[PDB]
Design an enzyme around this catalytic site. Structure first.
Site, PDB file in Angstrom:
ATOM      1  N   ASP A  80       0.841  -1.177   0.000  1.00  0.00           N
ATOM      2  CA  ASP A  80       0.000   0.000   0.000  1.00  0.00           C
ATOM      3  C   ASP A  80       0.882   1.233   0.000  1.00  0.00           C
ATOM      4  OD1 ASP A  80      -2.278  -1.628   0.128  1.00  0.00           O
ATOM      5  OD2 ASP A  80      -2.130  -1.730   2.313  1.00  0.00           O
TER       6      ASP A  80
ATOM      7  N   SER B   7       1.150   6.626   2.595  1.00  0.00           N
ATOM      8  CA  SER B   7       0.316   5.538   3.072  1.00  0.00           C
ATOM      9  C   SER B   7      -1.031   5.674   2.387  1.00  0.00           C
ATOM     10  CB  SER B   7       0.168   5.584   4.585  1.00  0.00           C
ATOM     11  OG  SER B   7      -0.539   4.467   5.073  1.00  0.00           O
ATOM     12  N   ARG B   8      -1.473   4.611   1.717  1.00  0.00           N
ATOM     13  CA  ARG B   8      -2.652   4.668   0.869  1.00  0.00           C
ATOM     14  C   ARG B   8      -3.929   4.343   1.617  1.00  0.00           C
ATOM     15  NH1 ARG B   8      -0.358   1.863  -4.740  1.00  0.00           N
ATOM     16  NH2 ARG B   8       1.615   3.006  -4.710  1.00  0.00           N
ATOM     17  N   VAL B   9      -3.958   4.606   2.919  1.00  0.00           N
ATOM     18  CA  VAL B   9      -5.134   4.415   3.750  1.00  0.00           C
ATOM     19  C   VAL B   9      -5.481   5.759   4.369  1.00  0.00           C
ATOM     20  CG1 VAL B   9      -6.089   3.167   5.704  1.00  0.00           C
ATOM     21  CG2 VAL B   9      -4.506   2.038   4.169  1.00  0.00           C
ATOM     22  N   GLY B  10      -4.555   6.302   5.141  1.00  0.00           N
ATOM     23  CA  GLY B  10      -4.651   7.681   5.584  1.00  0.00           C
ATOM     24  C   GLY B  10      -5.414   7.824   6.883  1.00  0.00           C
TER      25      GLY B  10
END
Ligand SMILES: Nc1ncnc2c1ncn2[C@@H]1O[C@H](COP(=O)(O)OP(=O)(O)OP(=O)(O)O)[C@@H](O)[C@H]1O
Ligand SMILES: [Mg+2]
Lengths: 105, 57, 49, 529, 170
Positions: free
Chosen positions: D329, D354-357
């Site tokens: 991610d 970070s691809r969630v955040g």
């Protein structure tokens, strides 16, 4: 023989005739080794005695007599207010010294 | 095999993990030199403070 | 005056205050526990005096 | 009773790998299954099928007792995949990827399983506190997330993961055993001494109850280094399926790729790019897509993954690196130019995302991280400037630099102990102090409550000594009616007492002895805090 | 006999929750209760408010987390972690009963400050505490006030006048 042809029955093939050959091992002093239908069963002294011996060897390796066994787990101190009222500033030093003594002494 | 380990610990030929000292209670819970272990049972602080050992063994 | 009474009571029974059973199970050797107990008394004595 | 089935004899052996010669023709071996090699009448050498051929020969990966292998030894077949023991009984142990324990001084789980499908996993909702402010604020790691750790040699790749493992412990002793996140440290191709020191570190901080270590050292066979991270994820299987949580730390995966290269090339597979076989992407894909936050139907379990990949000269153009950035991610890029340039952890924020955040991190951390992103985006544009307007400096040039000081750590930071240091920055209470005293401030802010000492106690509850306000902060948030005003009426007093009693004395030092003493104090503050 | 529940993927969901709540109440150590939540959730029965409050009851009333003791046990933190699992993760929201179980522990634990946080948070959510607990919180506060236990002692002692890495304790 009984084990031989019974193993031959357990195979996917049994219609094929069975030819038996008996040979001699200098390594094996007790028991036999039998192969039928590309399935081998080893019941020999060299194998069986070493199998039972392996248990003893493993058990001996597991134990550490030189070492000390672990003590029971300890809960949080939860010192009472009366202790703390008697000794406000000192209990921290005494707990640190207790850790020091538990490690060294 | 363990009795052999005990004898080796009493002679002092073997050592213990994290420099653990030899004592009778210590040893008991694991499981002339023997007399010294008997001395080791008694508290060191008690002996020194009260001078029990000063009189003799 | 309460604090004085508490100091007296603590000096009479220092061991009762601490958990004796827990400490005994926890400490491999009784000697360590004994040393810990000895320090607390001197602290109280120096405090009241 | 139990007759072992034989399939052939050992034809050839090349170091870690072998070639089988089948005995009969109608005999058929499966693929990926374990075989056994009767190295002696007593012992057995496990193995694995990697090739099958028109000649019937079998390309085999060896995993144990390689030195006892010869040519002509009888070869047996289990007809089952490679499995390992699994369960809670394994926590607190170092373990060969074959499940064998490595001494110090019923159930079985498949090593290769399909991943959670697209319905059997929930999106990321909950966090994983790695303990570092950059990673909790700006690079929020979550559960069911897989975030790479990039970096050149000796930059902190190993230590971020170890500190995650060490941060989780305090919480896990407080919270129930369902929400605790356990851990697995996989060492592929590392040195056996590094593993020993890790074991002793975790044992000091008592993080070994909730950690197992899968060791595949450099002397170990390449096949074992190859199947190590699968053993780790195989343990994660049970804690997924048992609804628990678990963390994975794949020490260098590049070293897991050299092993696959070794295997494949010695078994006469065709090479590829950088001499790899070509399907080394699918390898890490299989490994890393197994990470997930599982659906409530499947227990709401999880396993986070912190893979590590070594880097050479700060390039992200190597084959395996790109193959992993593609998969993971986010990424925590550690730059030697910053490690060498003083700051530790040497996170480079421009290249680390970070691809969630926000969805991962906390309600109380959303409002601070969203402020730090704005602040650092603005400081990124100005901080190249050697500060000329010393008094005309923008507030961003102040707050950003103090925040960089706060980013400097050694060990993990407690959540309550991290925000309250960052809140002051974003709201400017820590603007009159100088940069160099930004951490001593923090030290006193977190471990020496000044208003409790100097009598300025008007706050009813809010003090940093209790350490149980973390849960109230986590639930209610800082931007809440009950916590905002008390927070400000702790920090403004901390600032005034600092600026008056401590800062004042500091700037009055002229001697070299006293200034060197004060020097070393701040470095200690940078480490412990 | 109730509004059917659904998962995020719209799948139908079980509601037959009673048989699991009984396993919570029959528990003796409050870590097994969480495991009951787990074995309940695996069976497509997600927890409801009644179940979480059963767990908070079992937490408050149990003696220890596990059979053996554990260092770092905090009876409050588990209860206040369930509420994060409730509000944020699962979407369920607590009630007056839940925070009641929470406040009872801070009375038992003697921590009088965190109580006042809870006292304020309730009414910010419309919940109202029981004065039997509010008065006990103030009682613990007054006791710790007169006794000098208003704060720990290590905070109420002077700092090193001289900067030294050892004196500050680092
Ligand atoms: N935040 C930090 N504060 C202080 N020292 C640090 C920090 N991070 C890393 N270090 C130091 O950097 C050194 C290497 O760290 P680490 O073991 O993580 O390196 P690495 O990334 O594993 O590189 P390699 O794998 O080549 O060893 C150690 O001496 C470690 O203590
Ligand atoms: Mg490393």
């Amino acid at each position: 023989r009984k084990q031989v042809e019974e193993l031959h029955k357990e195979s996917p093939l049994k219609d094929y005739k069975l030819v038996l050959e008996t040979k001699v091992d200098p390594s094996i002093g007790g028991g036999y080794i039998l192969e039928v239908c590309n399935q081998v069963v080893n019941r020999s002294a060299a194998a069986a005695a070493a199998e039972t011996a392996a248990l003893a060897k493993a058990s001996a390796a597991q134990v550490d007599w030189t070492s000390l066994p672990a003590a029971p787990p300890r809960p949080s101190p939860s010192a009472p207010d009366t202790l703390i009222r008697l000794l406000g500033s000192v209990v921290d030093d005494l707990a640190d010294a207790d850790k020091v003594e538990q490690k060294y002494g | 095999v363990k009795f052999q380990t005990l004898y080796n610990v009493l002679t002092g030929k073997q050592h213990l993990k994290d420099q653990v000292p030899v004592k009778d209670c210590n040893l008991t819970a694991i499981f002339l030199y023997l007399k010294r272990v008997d001395l080791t049972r008694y508290t060191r602080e008690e002996l020194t403070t009260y001078g029990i050992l000063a009189c003799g063994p | 005056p309460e604090l004085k009474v508490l100091f007296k009571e603590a000096l009479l029974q220092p061991a009762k205050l601490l958990p004796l059973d827990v400490d005994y199970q926890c400490s491999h050797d009784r000697e360590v526990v004994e040393a810990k107990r000895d320090r607390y008394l001197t602290a109280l004595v120096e405090a009241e005096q | 009773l139990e007759a072992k089935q034989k399939i052939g004899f050992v034809h050839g052996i090349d170091g870690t790998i072998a070639t089988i010669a089948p005995a009969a023709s109608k005999v058929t071996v499966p693929y990926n299954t374990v075989l056994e090699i009767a190295v002696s009448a007593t012992n057995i050498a496990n193995a694995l099928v990697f090739n099958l051929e028109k000649d019937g020969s079998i390309g085999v990966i060896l995993l144990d007792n390689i030195s006892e292998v010869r040519s002509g030894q009888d070869v047996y077949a289990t007809g089952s995949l490679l499995k390992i023991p699994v369960g809670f009984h394994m926590l607190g142990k170092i373990i060969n990827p074959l499940g064998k324990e490595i001494p110090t001084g019923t159930k079985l789980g498949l090593v290769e399983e399909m991943a959670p499908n697209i319905v059997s996993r929930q999106p990321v909702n909950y966090n994983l506190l790695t303990g570092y402010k950059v990673i909790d604020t700006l690079i929020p790691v979550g559960r069911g997330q897989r975030e790479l750790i990039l970096g050149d040699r000796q930059t902190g790749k190993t230590s971020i993961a170890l500190s995650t493992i060490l941060n989780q412990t305090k919480v896990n002793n407080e919270i129930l055993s369902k929400n605790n996140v356990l851990s697995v440290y996989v060492s592929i191709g590392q040195r056996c001494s590094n593993v020993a020191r890790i074991h002793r570190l975790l044992t000091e901080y008592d993080a070994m109850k909730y950690c197992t270590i899968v060791a595949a050292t450099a002397a170990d066979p390449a096949g074992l280094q190859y199947l190590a991270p699968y053993a780790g994820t195989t343990l994660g299987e049970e804690f997924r399926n048992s609804g628990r949580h678990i963390l994975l730390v794949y020490d260098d995966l590049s070293k897991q790729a050299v092993s696959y290269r070794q295997i494949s090339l010695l078994l006469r597979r065709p090479p590829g790019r950088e001499a790899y076989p070509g399907d080394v992407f699918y390898l890490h894909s299989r490994l890393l897509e197994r990470s997930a936050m599982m659906s409530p139907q499947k227990g709401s379990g999880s396993l986070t993954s912190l893979p590590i990949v070594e880097t050479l000269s700060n390039d992200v153009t190597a084959y395996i690196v790109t193959n992993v950035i593609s998969i993971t991610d986010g990424q925590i890029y550690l730059d030697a130019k910053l490690f060498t340039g003083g700051q530790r952890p040497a996170v480079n924020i421009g290249l680390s995302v970070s691809r969630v955040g926000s969805s991962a991190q906390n309600k109380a951390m959303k409002k601070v991280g969203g402020a730090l992103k704005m602040l650092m985006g603005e400081y990124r544009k100005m901080a190249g400037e050697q500060t000329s307007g010393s008094q005309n400096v923008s507030p961003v040039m102040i707050r950003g630099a103090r925040c960089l000081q706060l980013f400097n750590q050694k060990g993990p930071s407690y959540f309550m102990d991290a925000i309250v240091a960052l809140y002051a920055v974003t709201n400017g209470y820590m603007d009159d102090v100088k940069l160099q005293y930004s951490k001593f401030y923090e030290f006193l802010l977190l471990n020496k409550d000044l208003p409790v000492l100097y009598g300025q106690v008007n706050n009813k509850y809010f003090y940093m000594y209790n350490k149980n306000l973390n849960y109230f902060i986590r639930y209610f948030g800082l931007n809440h009616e009950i916590l905002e005003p008390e927070l400000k009426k702790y920090i403004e007093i901390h600032t005034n007492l600092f600026l008056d009693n401590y800062q004042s004395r500091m700037n009055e030092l002229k001697s070299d002895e006293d200034l060197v003493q004060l020097k070393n104090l701040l470095y200690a503050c940078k480490r412990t805090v | 006999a109730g509004g059917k529940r659904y998962d995020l993927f719209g799948y139908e969901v079980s509601v037959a929750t009673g048989p699991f709540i009984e396993e919570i109440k029959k528990a003796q150590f409050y870590d097994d209760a969480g495991e009951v939540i787990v074995k309940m959730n695996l069976a497509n029965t997600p927890p409801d408010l009644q179940t979480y409050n059963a767990v908070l009851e079992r937490i408050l009333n149990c003696k220890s987390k596990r059979s053996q003791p554990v260092k770092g046990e905090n009876k409050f933190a588990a209860m206040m972690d369930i509420l994060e699992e409730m509000d944020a993760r699962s979407g369920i929201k607590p009630n007056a009963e839940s925070w009641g179980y929470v406040l009872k522990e801070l009375v038992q634990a003697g921590d009088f400050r965190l109580g006042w946080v809870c006292i304020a948070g309730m009414k910010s959510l419309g919940i109202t505490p029981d004065q039997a607990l509010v008065d006990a919180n103030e009682a613990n506060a007054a006791k710790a006030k007169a006794a000098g236990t208003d704060f720990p002692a290590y905070l109420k002692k002077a700092a090193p006048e001289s900067f030294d890495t050892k004196a500050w304790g680092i």
